[PDB]
RNA sequence: AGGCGCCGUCAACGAGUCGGGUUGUUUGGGAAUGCAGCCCAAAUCGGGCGGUAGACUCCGUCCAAGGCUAAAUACAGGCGAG
RNA sequence: AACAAAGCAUUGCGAUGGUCCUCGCGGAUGCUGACGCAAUGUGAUUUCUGCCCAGUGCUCUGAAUGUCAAAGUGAAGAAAUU
RNA sequence: CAGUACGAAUACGAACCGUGAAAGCGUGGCCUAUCGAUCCUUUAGACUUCGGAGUUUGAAGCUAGAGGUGUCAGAAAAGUUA
């Protein structure tokens, strides 16, 4: 279909044509703006329009800024204390992805709202940038819309945190189905190790 | 150390002759590589940088003492054999020649 | 006359056709980026070399937005 | 002596293969392979048990040969045939019958001892180079 | 391995710090509005007050000029010869008199200066401590560079826009005379950032230092220790160029 | 509006994704589990999978980078009872 | 008789100091500046402090020759592997 | 080693040669017997095998010999504590 295809086609090509110029220029902004930024426009309406975007009250879009690299593990210079299969500080990298951390940060600050989904809005050389959709549960317009009232249900509070986001399903291995998928579905704690 | 001719006559093991013919002697090493082996189990199993059981490369090691260390390669068929245990060191070869007898000079 | 010799939009179209034919075949030997060097390298190396270097930059792409949108349009009729 | 870890003996079944000795089957590699995937099963029964249960097998029709002497498709006499890839007839101990056995594989000294007038029959899947040429026809049975 | 060697204790902590509250105030050189041939910054020294944070004196200067923002004040670094009732001039057409501050460009070559900037408007870095001074060797009308020799003898290339004060710092010769009470050393330590008294490394038992241990006291290993060495290891003569008394010079130093 | 039959035909099909390397973690998962991190990087009748990698017709299956969704399972038990 | 001490030596440090704490921000350096700060040796005075750079440590210059990783790069080559 | 492995011997047969007149002798050193598993790697020979077909590449493997273990029936490996 429509106009939404072109910007989607652009954003493939982060490095090329108009998109490397315009988004490297918006990083002059992105470095300046905080690790909470609420904005009133999605940067990608295409991938808003395909992760759940309707303009309608209770909807916010927000940019989150997350550091690049792994994780560094306490205590350095009072170090463990244990045998070296378990010594690791920068060597280990989190097995949550940088996208999920952004989901957590966002849902903590906007505590009355619940993360729907999220997307990628670039990286420079130490920050990785995401824009995240959080959707009010508590207001009538979300409730009287049957495309987005499934979020309202009390079971769905703090869903980013319990890994029920799309990002949270993907790092949990739930992308496949079949062969393989056998240690991920229904849960990484699932059999209790019986 | 040893005179061993590089060029000898011997029986074949192999099933295309299964009789006696001329054979060529050579000392052998290569190693592998392209990685499917122990080398892989190590690459993966590093696992905190641990070479671990990739060392039995040491003790500081040393006692010296072998067996014959050969492959004798046919110069008339390409089928050709390695030999069984008895006790050498060290080993000389070159193209032989000879421990020549006899000397007046 | 020159460039190339010769023709113009059909020649852009041959080159534009040769480029997925070069690209799908790199994709069917993985990566992309080293095979895009190898698939080009294991070959004569002139017209393809310049054409490959621009696709490994930045690139085309307003024109790419123009051609893909027409092909998408004309495979959506 | 005891703490059952000084006279006991020892704790876990080791010192047993390495350096003390007896027991398990011990010191392993050795073949390993094929995986859990392209694997078993071929169901196999010797022709003497179909000869047990010829006379009492009165769900299998007798035909050209006398009433004891039955055509019987062995695929529909073998328990756990349906989860097996194929049903094979093995050749041990006599046949004293004038049978006609249908199989998905048969031994060469599996036809030969019941040569005693027989028709030994391949099912279509015995080949197994037979034409599932998109088409139609033959099938494998299904049951618990 | 060991209990932590004192050199990590620098680290952070109330014991390693100076009494920073006690220090008298910031003595930054007033970034001139503009002009300054006499008196859009005119000062009178009214007082000369000791600085505990460096042990040499400041001169209390007022400084009274207007605008809004206007900024004025306060206790500028003393030079030798500054007295109550002397005029201080701070800027580009200040008189070349001891105690006045102006950019190096305005200073005549061969004049001893103190409180010299690294970078323009940082207000003044080099030549600070008691009786020290930089010497401005070269300028020329140097659009590009003013060459100054710091008290160690290193020749530093600085932007001519860097301001300095004419004269050498007050309190010279402080170093000459011996403390001659342990107690004099003690109070002098209390004021500054330092854990004193210091026990020798050799004196301790092994856990406390690389030097420690051994029936008789002695450094078990060679004293001079690695640039590569980590903190805790790096003690003694760190990466020493030479040792023992003979055959060197002062630092020479190229550009 | 929905269904069936006939008629052509087809678009809501989701990009730093698929994919490769560098370094790790984890897994029964082995060249072949799943995930993290740095670098690179497609196509759009085209693509993805089938337990190492590369031609074909295909064969056989399936359309990711989106979502929701009742019931059945658990509860070394707040709360009621045997 | 041990430690400290004042006194005597080497060494690192040109500032966003080197050095200590810290993932980091930052801090401690220092709101100080080589007559200063750290790191160390020895230990009032008085007379003095010889010879050794082979080993070990450390440091210097290396625009040139044997060794010296990865990547990008070249060769065989469908890859990759050498 | 009285039943326990590698080793070693004491003989054969099968294949295959020599010398020798040949009968025979010749299964390493006058005799009394003179050393190394296990993964891996190495090669040898032929053959087996890696999950739609089809085709190259390697892999996996049987059987046998050589590369470390003298802590010699098989650990990857320095001291002090007053």
């Amino acid at each position: 279909m429509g106009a939404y295809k072109y910007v989607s086609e652009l954003w493939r090509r982060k490095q090329s044509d108009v998109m490397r110029f315009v988004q490297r220029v918006r990083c002059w902004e992105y470095r300046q703006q905080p690790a909470i930024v609420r904005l009133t426009r999605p940067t990608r309406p295409d991938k808003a329009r395909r992760l759940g975007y309707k303009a309608k009250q209770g909807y916010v879009v927000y940019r989150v800024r997350v550091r690049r690299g792994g994780r560094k593990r306490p205590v350095p210079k009072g170090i463990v204390y244990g045998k070296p299969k378990h010594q690791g500080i920068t060597q280990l990298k989190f097995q949550r992805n940088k996208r999920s951390v952004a989901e957590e940060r966002a849902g903590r600050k906007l505590g009355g709202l619940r993360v729907l989904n999220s997307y990628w809005v670039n990286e420079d050389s130490t920050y990785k940038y995401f824009e995240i959709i959080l959707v009010d549960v508590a207001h009538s317009a979300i409730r009287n819309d049957p495309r987005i009232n499934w979020l309202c249900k009390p079971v769905h509070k703090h869903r980013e945190l319990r890994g029920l986001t799309s990002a949270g399903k993907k790092y949990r291995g739930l992308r496949g189905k079949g062969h393989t998928h056998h240690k991920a579905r229904p849960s990484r704690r699932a059999t209790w190790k019986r | 150390m040893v005179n061993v001719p590089k060029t000898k006559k011997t029986y074949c093991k192999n099933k295309e002759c299964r009789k006696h013919t001329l054979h060529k002697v050579t000392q052998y090493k290569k190693g592998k590589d392209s990685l499917s082996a122990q080398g892989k189990r190590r690459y993966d199993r590093k696992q905190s940088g641990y070479g671990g059981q990739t060392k039995p490369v040491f003790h500081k090691k040393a006692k010296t003492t072998k067996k014959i260390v050969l492959k004798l390669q046919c110069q008339s068929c390409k089928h050709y054999s390695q030999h069984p245990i008895k006790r050498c060191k060290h080993f000389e070869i070159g193209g032989d020649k000879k421990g020549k007898g006899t000397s007046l000079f | 006359g020159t460039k190339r010799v010769h023709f113009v939009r059909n020649l852009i179209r041959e080159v534009a056709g040769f480029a997925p034919y070069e690209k799908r075949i790199t994709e069917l030997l993985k990566v992309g980026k080293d095979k895009r060097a190898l698939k080009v390298a294991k070959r004569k190396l002139g017209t393809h070399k310049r054409a490959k270097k621009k696709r490994e930059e930045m690139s085309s792409v307003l024109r790419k937005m123009r051609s893909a949108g027409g092909g998408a349009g004309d495979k959506k009729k | 002596m005891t703490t059952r870890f000084k006279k006991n003996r020892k704790k876990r079944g080791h010192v047993s293969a390495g350096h003390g000795r007896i027991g398990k089957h011990r010191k392993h590699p050795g073949g390993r392979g094929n995986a859990g995937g392209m694997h078993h099963h071929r169901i196999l029964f010797d022709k003497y048990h179909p000869g047990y249960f010829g006379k009492v097998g009165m769900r299998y029709f007798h035909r050209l040969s006398n009433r004891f002497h039955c055509p019987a498709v062995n695929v529909e006499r073998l328990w756990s045939m349906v989860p097996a890839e194929a049903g094979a007839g093995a050749g041990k101990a006599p046949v004293i019958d004038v049978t006609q056995f249908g199989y998905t594989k048969v031994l060469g000294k599996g036809m030969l001892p019941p040569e005693r007038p027989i028709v030994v029959k391949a099912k279509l899947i015995s080949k197994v180079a037979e034409k599932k040429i998109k088409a139609a026809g033959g099938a494998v049975l299904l049951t618990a | 391995m060991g209990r932590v060697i004192r050199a990590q204790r620098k680290g952070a902590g109330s014991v390693f710090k100076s009494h920073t509250h006690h220090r008298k105030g910031p003595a930054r050189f007033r970034s001139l509005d503009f002009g300054e041939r006499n008196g859009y910054l005119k000062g009178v020294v009214t007082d000369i007050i000791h600085d505990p944070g460096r042990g040499a004196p400041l001169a209390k200067v007022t400084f009274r000029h207007p605008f809004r923002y206007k900024h004025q004040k306060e206790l500028f670094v003393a030079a030798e010869g500054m007295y109550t009732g002397q005029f201080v001039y701070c800027g580009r057409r200040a008189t070349l008199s001891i105690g006045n501050v102006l950019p190096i460009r305005s200073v005549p070559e061969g004049a001893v200066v103190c409180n010299v900037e690294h970078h323009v408007g940082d207000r003044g870095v080099f030549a600070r401590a008691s009786g020290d001074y930089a010497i401005v060797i070269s300028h020329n009308p140097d659009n590009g560079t003013s060459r100054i020799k710091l008290p160690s003898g290193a020749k530093k290339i600085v932007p001519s826009s860097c301001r300095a004060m004419i004269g050498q710092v007050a309190g010279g010769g402080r170093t000459e005379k011996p403390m001659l009470k342990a107690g004099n050393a003690y109070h002098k330590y209390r004021v500054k950032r330092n854990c004193w008294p210091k026990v020798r490394g050799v004196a301790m038992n092994p856990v406390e230092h690389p030097h420690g241990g051994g029936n008789h006291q002695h450094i078990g290993h060679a004293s001079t220790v690695r640039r590569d060495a980590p903190p805790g290891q790096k003690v003694g003569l760190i990466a020493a160029r030479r040792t023992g008394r003979l055959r060197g010079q002062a630092a020479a130093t190229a550009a």
Side-chain angles (χ1 to χ4, degrees), chain B residues 31-90:
Chain B
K32 223 177 208 165
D33 240 324
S34 202
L35 202 69
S36 304
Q38 65 288 326
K40 232 182 292 154
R41 314 197 308 235
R42 312 298 179 238
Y43 169 96
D44 332 313
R45 295 194 195 238
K46 59 122 218 182
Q47 215 98 110
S48 198
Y50 247 116
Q53 20 272 83
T54 198
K55 171 169 165 258
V57 297
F58 305 141
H59 188 58
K60 15 294 207 188
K61 71 142 224 155
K63 312 92 195 186
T64 46
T65 308
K66 301 182 184 308
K67 304 198 259 185
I68 59 180
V69 289
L70 313 176
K71 36 164 51 42
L72 298 74
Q73 308 175 309
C74 191
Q75 250 51 77
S76 190
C77 63
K78 197 284 305 137
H79 302 264
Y80 104 70
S81 306
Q82 305 258 135
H83 291 307
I85 318 166
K86 244 69 187 182
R87 195 73 41 242
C88 304
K89 199 191 212 85
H90 190 36

Side-chain angles (χ1 to χ4, degrees), chain E residues 6-8 11 17 20 130-131 200 217 227 231 237 241-242:
Chain E
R6 181 190 73 128
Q8 319 304 104
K17 205 181 178 76
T20 202
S130 302
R200 297 179 299 133
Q217 296 183 24
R227 264 247 142 91
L237 297 183
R241 275 60 172 230
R242 61 171 308 288

Side-chain angles (χ1 to χ4, degrees), chain D residues 1-64 71-144:
Chain D
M1 201 199 280
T2 177
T3 288
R4 263 179 64 158
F5 284 132
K6 46 212 237 138
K7 231 300 184 173
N8 177 38
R9 315 76 36 101
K10 221 220 65 52
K11 204 195 294 178
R12 288 190 160 186
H14 199 242
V15 177
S16 81
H19 48 141
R21 37 275 225 135
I22 216 141
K24 304 171 85 159
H25 183 108
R26 75 311 282 183
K27 187 274 118 155
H28 302 116
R32 53 217 181 274
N34 309 276
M38 183 61 187
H39 207 153
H40 278 292
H41 193 262
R42 314 186 74 78
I43 193 165
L44 187 287
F45 265 80
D46 287 287
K47 21 88 293 185
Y48 82 102
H49 144 238
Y52 277 29
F53 296 165
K55 189 182 73 176
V56 285
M58 290 180 37
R59 302 288 74 204
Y60 305 110
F61 283 93
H62 34 70
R63 205 167 199 83
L64 304 177
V73 191
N74 202 53
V75 181
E76 21 283 11
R77 208 199 226 89
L78 299 197
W79 314 310
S80 208
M81 172 62 223
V82 166
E85 161 264 8
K92 188 162 65 271
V95 169
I96 185 63
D97 181 19
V98 193
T99 195
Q100 326 182 254
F101 278 118
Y103 298 104
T104 307
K105 170 66 194 174
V106 186
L107 299 190
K109 309 178 181 166
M111 77 149 283
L112 180 144
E115 66 220 294
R116 317 192 178 221
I118 188 153
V119 180
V120 22
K121 175 160 174 47
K123 198 173 274 196
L124 299 155
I125 179 168
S126 197
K127 291 193 288 154
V128 194
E130 199 17 84
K131 303 174 301 301
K132 188 117 292 184
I133 189 168
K134 276 186 187 281
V140 180
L141 315 188
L142 289 307
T143 176

Side-chain angles (χ1 to χ4, degrees), chain A residues 72 75-78:
Chain A
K72 295 198 188 153
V75 161
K77 227 203 113 302

Side-chain angles (χ1 to χ4, degrees), chain A residues 31-192:
Chain A
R31 285 191 174 218
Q32 281 184 309
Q33 293 175 300
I36 149 176
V37 185
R38 202 191 56 151
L39 197 63
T40 203
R41 303 277 86 231
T43 306
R44 281 190 82 177
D46 61 302
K47 179 63 56 176
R49 187 166 152 135
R50 274 79 203 254
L51 292 164
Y53 166 42
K54 286 188 77 184
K56 169 160 302 180
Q57 292 198 357
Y59 181 94
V60 288
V61 61
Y62 173 102
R63 199 184 298 121
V64 213
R65 177 167 157 173
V66 180
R67 67 76 56 77
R68 278 178 28 167
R71 183 196 193 212
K72 295 198 188 153
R73 172 180 157 182
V75 161
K77 227 203 113 302
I79 198 173
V80 288
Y81 293 174
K83 313 164 91 68
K85 144 73 161 210
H86 291 292
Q87 166 132 235
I89 156 168
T90 310
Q91 298 188 166
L92 271 48
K93 300 124 186 163
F94 298 111
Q95 322 182 37
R96 319 212 300 319
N97 44 238
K98 308 176 176 178
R99 175 166 166 203
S100 182
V101 175
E103 305 184 303
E104 285 198 71
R105 294 180 170 171
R108 189 63 76 270
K109 175 62 169 167
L110 274 37
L113 333 171
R114 305 186 195 193
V115 178
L116 203 293
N117 214 327
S118 52
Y119 63 106
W120 211 106
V121 292
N122 310 300
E123 65 283 319
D124 41 44
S125 46
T126 211
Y127 302 124
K128 193 155 183 71
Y129 309 99
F130 293 85
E131 270 166 354
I132 185 174
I133 307 173
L134 298 89
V135 180
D136 191 46
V137 148
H139 180 246
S140 202
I142 311 106
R143 300 181 185 177
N144 285 279
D145 187 316
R147 302 284 136 259
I148 190 141
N149 190 30
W150 52 263
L151 189 65
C152 298
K153 204 168 198 284
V155 186
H156 240 153
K157 184 183 185 287
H158 292 128
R159 66 188 290 268
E160 42 275 354
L161 289 136
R162 312 158 61 213
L164 282 166
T165 37
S166 194
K169 291 182 183 183
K170 288 184 67 177
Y171 84 80
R172 222 125 59 80
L174 293 172
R175 181 266 174 284
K177 287 215 172 174
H179 191 94
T180 220
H181 201 58
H182 145 48
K183 281 83 183 296
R185 202 180 277 163
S187 205
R188 169 178 162 169
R189 204 200 175 276
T191 194
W192 221 301

